[PDB]
């Protein structure tokens, strides 16, 4: 992973932002990413939420 | 080695710059330095990159 610049992850001022980023970022499922790509051209029948 | 002023290498604010300097600076090969000196007068046949 490389969500942060060097040093910043361990920086004390930054802790709030890193808890935010780590909360948003997830483990990379290749499945959900290929899926996210294919959904971009796939016809939509059921409505996405 | 003396890339940094006293104290600064251990200073916390400085860490970014010291990681930069330590990334650039290498162990001193006397060979490559004599070489760098001689290349300054040596005719160039093959083109340097």
UniProtKB/Swiss-Prot annotation, chains A, B:
Assembly behavior: Homodecamer; each decamer is made up of two conformers of VP2, called VP2A and VP2B. 12 homodecamers assemble to form an icosahedral capsid.
Family that this chain belongs to: Belongs to the turreted BTV-fold inner capsid family.
Subcellular location: Virion
Name of the protein this chain belongs to: Inner capsid protein VP1
Function: Inner capsid protein that self-assembles to form an icosahedral capsid with a T=2 symmetry, which consists of 120 copies of VP2, with channels at each of its five-fold vertices. This capsid constitutes the innermost concentric layer of the viral mature particle.
Coiled coil: none
